[PDB]
Design a protein around this ligand. Structure first.
Ligand SMILES: [Cl-]
Ligand SMILES: [Cl-]
Length: 162
């Protein structure tokens, strides 16, 4: 198991513009297009992202290309962030994947907002961090996915995904 396979299980794959759990226009493997309500603003973002007139539909390769970019940006976002980097550096490889998953889903700003949990992760207080991570809108809104991520943090293994 790896970050790509992990995120592909959590996000799924859709070749047509769809709405995410929050109601925003997305495509591919969890690629957010726009928070705007306009499907046209979504089609426009999409064409801009792909470099062609898509009419809201993309190929598997196109989906994968967006996905490769998004994982790369997520890692680089972590490494550039003063609050995130120290945590990331302190973690083992499996747990690193869990933090990348949170950032891909909620952005660097969002994760950086989990101040107390980040501190507990840095100190390697697994059980306590897992408890604190659960007291969030994140867990409340997407509980099955949050549990998987959280279990990865708690255990340091890929069990939740197997
Ligand atoms: Cl893009
Ligand atoms: Cl969920």
């Amino acid at each position: 198991m790896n970050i790509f396979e992990m995120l592909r299980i959590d996000e799924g794959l859709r070749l047509k513009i769809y709405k995410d759990t929050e109601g925003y226009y997305t495509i591919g493997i969890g690629h957010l297009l726009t928070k705007s309500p306009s499907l046209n603003a979504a089609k426009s973002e999409l064409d801009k992202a792909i470099g062609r007139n898509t009419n809201g539909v993309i190929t598997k390769d196109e989906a994968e290309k967006l996905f490769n970019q998004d994982v790369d940006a997520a890692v680089r976002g972590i490494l550039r962030n003063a609050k995130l980097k120290p945590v990331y550096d302190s973690l083992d490889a499996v747990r690193r994947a869990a933090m990348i998953n949170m950032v891909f889903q909620m952005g660097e700003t969002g994760v950086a907002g989990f101040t107390n949990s980040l501190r507990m992760l840095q100190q390697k207080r697994w059980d306590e961090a897992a408890v604190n991570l659960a007291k969030s809108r994140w867990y409340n809104q997407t509980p099955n996915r949050a549990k998987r991520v959280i279990t990865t943090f708690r255990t340091g293994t890929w069990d939740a995904y197997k």
